Amino acid sequence: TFAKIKFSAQIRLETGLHIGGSDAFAAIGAINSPVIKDPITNLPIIPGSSLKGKMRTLLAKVYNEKVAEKPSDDSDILSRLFGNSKDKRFKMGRLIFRDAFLSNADELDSLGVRSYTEVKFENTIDRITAEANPRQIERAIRNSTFDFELIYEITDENENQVEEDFKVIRDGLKLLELDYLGGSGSRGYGKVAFENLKATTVFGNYDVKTLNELLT
Amino acid sequence: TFAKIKFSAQIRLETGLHIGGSDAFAAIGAINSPVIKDPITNLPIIPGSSLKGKMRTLLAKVYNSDILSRLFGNSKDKRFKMGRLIFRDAFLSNADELDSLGVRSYTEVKFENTIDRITAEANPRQIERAIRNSTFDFELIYEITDENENQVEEDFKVIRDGLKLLELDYLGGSGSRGYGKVAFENLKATTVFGNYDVKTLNELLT
Amino acid sequence: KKEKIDLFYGALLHNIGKVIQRATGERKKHALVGADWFDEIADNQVISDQIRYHMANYQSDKLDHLAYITYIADNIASGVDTYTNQADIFNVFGAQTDKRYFKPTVLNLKSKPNFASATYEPFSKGDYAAIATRIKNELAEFEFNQVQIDSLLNLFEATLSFVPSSTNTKEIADISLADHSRLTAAFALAIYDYLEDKGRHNYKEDLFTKVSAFYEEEAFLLASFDLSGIQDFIYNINIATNGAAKQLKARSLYLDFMSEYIADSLLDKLGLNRANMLYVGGGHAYFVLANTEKTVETLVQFEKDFNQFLLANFQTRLYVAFGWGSFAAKDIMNSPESYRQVYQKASRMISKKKISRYDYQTLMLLNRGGKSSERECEICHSVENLVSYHDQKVCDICRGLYQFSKEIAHDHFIITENEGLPIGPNACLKGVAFEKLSQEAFSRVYVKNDYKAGTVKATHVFVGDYQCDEIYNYAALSKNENGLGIKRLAVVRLDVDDLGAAFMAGFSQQGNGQYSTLSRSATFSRSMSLFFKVYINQFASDKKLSIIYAGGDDVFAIGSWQDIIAFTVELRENFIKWTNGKLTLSAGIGLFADKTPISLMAHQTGELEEAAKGNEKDSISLFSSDYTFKFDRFITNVYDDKLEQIRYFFNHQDERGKNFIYKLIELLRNHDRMNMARLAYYLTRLEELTRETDRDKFKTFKNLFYSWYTNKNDKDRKEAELALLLYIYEIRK
Amino acid sequence: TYKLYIMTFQNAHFGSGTLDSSKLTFSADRIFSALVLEALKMGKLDAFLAEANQDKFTLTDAFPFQFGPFLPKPIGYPKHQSVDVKEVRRQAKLSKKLQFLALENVDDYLNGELFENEEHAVIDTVTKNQPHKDDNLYQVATTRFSNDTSLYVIANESDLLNELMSSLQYSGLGGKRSSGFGRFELDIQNIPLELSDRLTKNHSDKVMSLTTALPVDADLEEAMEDGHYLLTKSSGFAFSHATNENYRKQDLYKFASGSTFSKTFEGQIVDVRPLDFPHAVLNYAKPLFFKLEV
Ligand SMILES: [Zn+2]
């Protein structure tokens, strides 16, 4: 068979997220580090490169039994899952991390929210001379959702990695429920929460009855 | 019998698209990797070769042989040179509409980087994409000969199945990080200089 | 014939005693003392009386003689009928400008670039001992034969290329003596063939006491051959191909040797030799031949034979086009209208032959069918003589090209009958080192970039090639030892701006047609040959690059980008010293990443090259067609003024690193009216943010930066953006 | 000889012996073999061959169509104020790579016209690949049209012809057809009086070929004795349907379009069938002309 499987999920923000964007020289008093927004709707967009590369750099610590000097040196548990540039059979690596374009806006404007991107203020104080240095950085608002989805494709090339990859990706989702996923994380941004990890086999003879009993 | 029918469709870009062209110069702060463009209008256009083999890289993953040989072509296999399909490009039908949604240029610049795994140093990119929900003209000329007349209706459940999978794969480049979800619409089946009725097909596509 | 060589040597060694009487300051004329020099070196009495009795008062002391030829061989070879230096060829090019004079030195390998000026108007009397006695060394015991017909034609190009003639003059003052001797021997061979094909014997009356009869008789041919398909044969390389520079060097050197051997087969098929061929360049080559049926029918015979050769191994991928203008002794000041209307007659014959390509038998043999072909030599799409070089199916010419690319690094090139690439009918060409020379069999050997003779008595061709490192590590040789610099490789394709117009019209802009002669054009094209075919190995000496192709009006040089930019800087800043600022060159330099293909890269370099061409008369195009400056604006403002201020400003401080440079580049690139206000905010906000010690450096730099940013010209803005791009690429980690 | 069939492509790939280059016009072997192969998809090859081996019909290769007629430069025929060398020597470089002319001063061209060639239909080159393969950088050249230029083959207005020409709309006419190139749109117009009068075939006069030609083996000597032309090597592989092989054709050297003559000849359908191959390979070259001054 050929089994493409779609992982419907709800990225709900808490401690609202900022992904970087155009640090091309913006206006004077305006936002210094603006968020990347989808140019049709101007809602915040969490692109798939942040998700895939962040889950790459976080599953580095989990499933690379050896220390990895670079993402080419990922093991053959992650090279088949996130792609690899120098491996023989692990190019085109089976996971299309689709984006999310701020799914709810009829809900988030039903709550009395002016704009979906707050402009939180920040500065820095040097320890010597204590000079201030202010900045206005853009973030998405707190209780947003994000209709995020994966595409895992099973081409009968594996035939044994049915659940050898979902214990990896589900615990990566747990990592992202703990770690920040995007932007100035160590100041406490991002903090996505993954809700309703709904897998559905959009192509293939396959059941989720052995899948969502682990993915909860 | 002689028949030529075409697959009229508007393609829709649910994310960006990176289909790279000839690189010129970094230009220090300029876009690093551009998308391919029409040279007359400087508009983002999916080239037909990108549309052709991307279906072939998905039909081979299901239909495995002889059916891929008859559907696309081959170097060997004397029956199946010029394998009964002709594509075209995708000339961005909604430029009249996209001034009314409100957008400056139809090509955005997704910024990106490369955090090193140990050094923890970034490495930024300016990946140019074509913006969301742009609808493109897409036409696929299937041609029917007398020898094919046994399995013509079978092959029309492969091209439709070839576009049911292209809405589940990226149809572009650097598409494992998004840049895909490319959804077809108005996927009809007219006829163009060929007296074979398309009423056996239009309820299966639309 | 045997007497033909004697006439050639006797007329060619005219004014050799001028070097001697310039060396020692001797008596009445050069005419008597040159024959004394010839009597002192060796023994040939016919050549002796030829040098004795060439003058008007001297030829009566001879007698028929070989000297009544030798007089009229000289005066038509001279454009007109002491202690001065050689005037500039570019003194008569252009308009009334800075007048320069040459400096008398010999030629040496990768040593001297003798730029003319006014500082060399004083005269050197001691260097003749380094020249004339030098000849008295190397031409001490010179046997007068055909095997050494070659190296003596080397020797004047080594010795008398910077030595003038007619020192005590006022108007016509820039003829070097070596090319004058070449033209004099060519005219002697022309007179000898025209007078020995008509069978005339007594030259004492029809040449001497009635000089006007032959002097107004259309008895000369100005022949040429334009090669066709040259750039298509060079750029037959495609993308994803083995030979990056090996293939391209081999192809555009093999075409140069083909354009040399078409001459060297045209001349010995007649009685002529290298003195009759005036200028060989990029396929185009111009001659002086005699006018008779034994000239013309043999020309058309070898035209059809060489065309059969090119059709046999190429199938119309190359085509020789002859053409011969019939002309009298008219090109002596009528001199405007004497050159131009009949020099174009051979050019209109070139256009006539290049468009009525072949005859019925050849094309009838061409598309006669009779070939079952499955495999192709996908280099040139051909089928003939297919072999299986390195598991690919290529032809024999496209395998001898790989042998030629392996043997180009030698210094000599023999012509065999079955070894190497074919350059003519039963004439193949194979490279060879110096010590392997006298062992193998040959009939003509070339040497690349020498001035002394060598071993097998070679013809001294000139073709500037270079390999500092190989082509695959000019990326790796781009960073400094610190790691500062970006792993690039830049490709420059120069082009001399309208060398066709500088060649065809050129000096004819000046004067009333007084300087619209052939000698100045041959000397100018030999000067272009001597710069673009020898001297580029001097400007590329310390710098790390590879001159893939050079010569004529094109230089394709790949290499590392700092050395490529500095090499273009030094090439034009010594070319405008070489060419007095006239003939500005229009280079185009593109950056390309590591391991990107070269026919993908040569196309973009050519696109930037033609965009730099159409800018004005000249421009550099750097890293993209929107960076298009005059060279007079590029090296002075960017690479001398702005880049050093920018480098010193960021070296002698450590706050403003690369983020500030990137934002300055972006404000230089977007640049609406509002971005000048944003930059006036940016520099002033950073002005009070730097530390108090090195603060006024920033204050004078923002004062000096807002000068060119808001300069309202756009001639001082893209310059600064490119200066910052060059600095960023120089400090890339 | 009759009305001409306008074809606007917008995406063309036109040979030039290689893959990395592309022409603008297609030398009338491509359109002939496209009508021939399009007839074989219906089994209708014999009908077009019965038309083809008889001299009622004609053809003419492509030329630019921007609101009307463009024709070749008479190759080598601008006929020869011989001063002011900065102009009359300079303009020959800008009047040799011109190669396409307008009818409304094509008789002012022969008397001497400037003819700034407009940049209709710029040839483009776009790189392409093959993923997970060893050598993949094959550079597809692409002849991309400037939104009004068309190509207009001139032939006898036949219905067996027009079935083929209205199937070639969706068959494609160019190099990389199944990659989405060469798909034109067809809309037949009339001919002006100053063209269709001059479309002679036997006028013993100073005449110019309007398509790539090749004479009778008797006529070839008298063709070359007056001809000013080029050759331009009609070559390439042979596209059949019963091979499991790919054989080259027989290297037919045509007389390319723009071939001026005097005492015009009779062209032919020169078989360049591969040696011991089943069916013939037609390779049309018979010329429809244009009187230069007549
Ligand atoms: Zn080849």
Q: How far is CA C32 from CA C36, C38, C49, C177, C534, in A?
A: 7, 10, 10, 18, 37
Expressed in angstroms and rounded, the spacing between residue C244 Cα and the centre of ligand 1 is: 15
Are A24 and C681 an interchain contact pair (Cβ–Cβ within 8 Å)?
A: no
Are C356 and D253 an interchain contact pair (Cβ–Cβ within 8 Å)?
A: no
**Is C147 within 8 Å of C62 (Cβ atoms)?**
no
Identify the three-state secondary structure at position B190.
Answer: strand
Which residues contact residue D48 at a Cβ distance below 8 angstroms, ignoring those fewer than 6 apart?
Answer: D35, D36, D39, D160, D161, D164
Ligand 1 ion: residues within 5 Å (CB):
C 377, 379-380, 398
Tell me A145's DSSP state: -
φ, ψ (nearest 5 deg) of residue D122: -65, 130
Query: Which positions in chain B have a beta carbon within 8 angstroms of at least one beta carbon in chain D?
Result: 2, 4, 6, 21-22, 36, 38-40, 47-49, 51-53, 57, 72-73, 75-79, 81-83, 85-89, 141, 143, 145-146, 192-193
Name the region of D251 (left: φ>0; alpha: ψ -120 to 50; beta: rest). Answer: left
* B118 contacts on A by Cβ (under 8 Å): 67, 69-70
Are B28 and C728 an interchain contact pair (Cβ–Cβ within 8 Å)?
A: yes
Expressed in angstroms and rounded, the spacing between residue C319 Cα and the centre of ligand 1 is: 17
> Nearest CA to CA, how far is A40 from chain B (Å)?
6
Chain C residue with CA closest to B121: the answer is C733
Identify the three-state secondary structure at position B18.
Answer: strand
Chain B residue with CA closest to D42: the answer is B2
In chain D the beta strands, taken as DSSP E runs, fall at 4-8, 70-72, 100-102, 123-128, 138-143, 153-154, 185-188, 206-209, 260-262, 268-269, 284-285, 289-291
**Is C323 within 8 Å of C347 (Cβ atoms)?**
yes
* D131 contacts on A by Cβ (under 8 Å): 92
Gap between the Cα atoms of C211 and C205, Å rounded: 8
Report how many Cβ contacts below 8 Å link chain A to chain B.
85
* C667 contacts on A by Cβ (under 8 Å): 25
Gap between the Cα atoms of C414 and C393, Å rounded: 28
Half-sphere exposure of D23 (CA within 13 A, CB side): 23
Tell me C598's DSSP state: S
* B23 contacts on C by Cβ (under 8 Å): 593, 596
- D186's tokens: 């067809």
What are the extents of the domains in chain A?
A: 1-216
Residues in chain A: 216
Identify the three-state secondary structure at position B9.
Answer: strand
Q: Does A25 touch chain C (CB under 8 A)?
A: yes
> Nearest CA to CA, how far is C73 from chain D (Å)?
31
* Type and span of the H or E element at C277: strand C277-280
Amino acid at site B67: I
Gap between the Cα atoms of A197 and A201, Å rounded: 13
By DSSP bridging, strand D153-154 and strand D70-72 are: unpaired
* C594 contacts on B by Cβ (under 8 Å): none
Identify the three-state secondary structure at position A4.
Answer: strand
Q: How far is CA C229 from CA B46, C402, C600, in A?
A: 37, 20, 20
By DSSP bridging, strand C620-622 and strand C588-592 are: parallel
Are D178 and B79 an interchain contact pair (Cβ–Cβ within 8 Å)?
A: no
Q: How far is CA C198 from CA A36, C7, C184, C222, C294, in A?
A: 90, 17, 21, 19, 11
* A25 contacts on C by Cβ (under 8 Å): 663, 666-667, 670, 675, 678, 682
- Among C664, C665, C678, most A C-beta atoms within 10 A, so best to mutate, is C678
Tell me C507's DSSP state: G
* D72 contacts on C by Cβ (under 8 Å): none
Are A25 and C678 an interchain contact pair (Cβ–Cβ within 8 Å)?
A: yes
Gap between the Cα atoms of C548 and C545, Å rounded: 9
List the Cα angle C337/C340/C345 in 5-degree steps. 120
CB < 8 Å & 24+ apart, contacts of C475-482: C475/C560, C475/C594, C475/C595, C477/C544, C477/C560, C478/C560, C478/C561, C478/C562, C479/C732
- A144's tokens: 């947003």
Amino acid at site C614: G
For residue B68, the Cα-to-chain-centroid distance in whole angstroms is: 18
Gap between the Cα atoms of C524 and C532, Å rounded: 12
Amino acid at site D135: D
Burial C501-518 (b: 16+ CB within 10 A, else e): ebbbbbbbbbeebbbbbb
> Nearest CA to CA, how far is D128 from chain A (Å)?
18
- Among B35, B86, B138, B196, most D C-beta atoms within 10 A, so best to mutate, is B86
For residue A22, the Cα-to-chain-centroid distance in whole angstroms is: 19
Q: Which of B22, B25, B29 sits opposite C666 (nearest CB)?
A: B29
Q: Which residues pair with D139 in a beta bridge?
A: D127
Nearest to C76 by CA among C201, C197, C217, C199: C217
**Is C712 within 8 Å of C678 (Cβ atoms)?**
no
Tell me D111's DSSP state: T
Name the region of A83 (left: φ>0; alpha: ψ -120 to 50; beta: rest). Answer: left
- D50's tokens: 């019965």
HEC states along A21-71? CCCCCCCCCCCCECCCECCCCCCECECHHHHHHHHHHHHHHHHCCCCCCCH
- A169's tokens: 């990706």
Gap between the Cα atoms of B79 and B145, Å rounded: 12
Residues in chain B: 206
Number of C-beta neighbours around residue C142 at 10 A:
16
**Is C85 within 8 Å of C65 (Cβ atoms)?**
no
Are A25 and C666 an interchain contact pair (Cβ–Cβ within 8 Å)?
A: yes
Exposed, middle or buried, C114 (CB in 10 Å: 0-12/13-18/19+)? Answer: middle
Residue with tokens 């099973």: A154
Nearest to D120 by CA among D93, D147, D102, D101: D147
| Sign for the pseudo-dihedral over CA of C388, C390, C396, C398 | positive
- Neighbors of chain C by Cβ distance (3+ pairs < 8 Å): A, B, D
Which residues contact residue C324 at a Cβ distance below 8 angstroms, ignoring those fewer than 6 apart?
Answer: C221, C222, C223, C224, C289, C291, C296, C299, C346, C349
In A30-184 the beta strands, taken as DSSP E runs, fall at 117-122, 135-140, 147-154
Expressed in angstroms and rounded, the spacing between residue C374 Cα and the centre of ligand 1 is: 15
Q: Which of C623, C665, C728 sits opposite B25 (nearest CB)?
A: C623
Burial D129-148 (b: 16+ CB within 10 A, else e): eeeeeeeebebbbbbbbeee
> Nearest CA to CA, how far is D210 from chain B (Å)?
29
Gap between the Cα atoms of D168 and D35, Å rounded: 8
Gap between the Cα atoms of C249 and B52, Å rounded: 39
By DSSP bridging, strand C285-287 and strand C277-280 are: antiparallel
**Through-space distance between the first and last CA atoms of chain A, rounded to whole angstroms:** 26
Q: Does B25 touch chain C (CB under 8 A)?
A: yes
For residue C254, the Cα-to-chain-centroid distance in whole angstroms is: 16
Compute the radius of gyration of chain A from its Cα atoms: 20
Resolution value (Å, 1 decimal): 3.8
DSSP states along C164-210: BS--S-SS----BHHHHHHHHHHHHHHHHHHHHHTT---HIIIIIIT
Experimental method: cryo-EM
- C433's tokens: 């080192």
Torsion of CA D66, D72, D73, D77, to 10 degrees: -150
Expressed in angstroms and rounded, the spacing between residue B146 Cα and the centre of ligand 1 is: 42
Gap between the Cα atoms of C536 and C551, Å rounded: 9
> Nearest CA to CA, how far is C515 from chain A (Å)?
60
Gap between the Cα atoms of C19 and C128, Å rounded: 7
Q: Which of C666, C681, C682 sits opposite A24 (nearest CB)?
A: C666
Longest dimension (CA), chain D: 64
CB < 8 Å & 24+ apart, contacts of A196-199: A196/A8, A196/A9, A196/A10, A197/A7, A197/A8, A197/A9, A197/A170, A197/A173, A198/A7, A198/A8, A198/A9, A199/A5, A199/A6, A199/A7, A199/A8
Q: How far is CA D62 from CA A151, C272, D255, in A?
A: 49, 50, 15
Torsion of CA C555, C561, C567, C569, to 10 degrees: 110
Amino acid at site D167: S
* B87 contacts on D by Cβ (under 8 Å): 178-180
Q: Which residues pair with D143 in a beta bridge?
A: D12, D123
Expressed in angstroms and rounded, the spacing between residue C238 Cα and the centre of ligand 1 is: 11
Q: Which of C359, C367, C500 sits opposite D224 (nearest CB)?
A: C359
Chain D residue with CA closest to A87: the answer is D132
Nearest to D36 by CA among D154, D168, D150, D156: D168
Which residues contact residue B177 at a Cβ distance below 8 angstroms, ignoring those fewer than 6 apart?
Answer: A47, A48, A49, A51, A52, A53, A97
* C733 contacts on B by Cβ (under 8 Å): none
φ, ψ (nearest 5 deg) of residue C564: -70, -45
Q: Which of B22, B24, B29 sits opposite C624 (nearest CB)?
A: B24
Nearest to D109 by CA among D72, D84, D57, D59: D72
Gap between the Cα atoms of C320 and C307, Å rounded: 7
> Nearest CA to CA, how far is D251 from chain C (Å)?
6
Gap between the Cα atoms of C543 and D95, Å rounded: 42
Gap between the Cα atoms of D232 and D243, Å rounded: 28
Are C669 and B24 an interchain contact pair (Cβ–Cβ within 8 Å)?
A: no
Nearest to D93 by CA among C101, A163, C351: C351
By DSSP bridging, strand B125-130 and strand B107-112 are: antiparallel
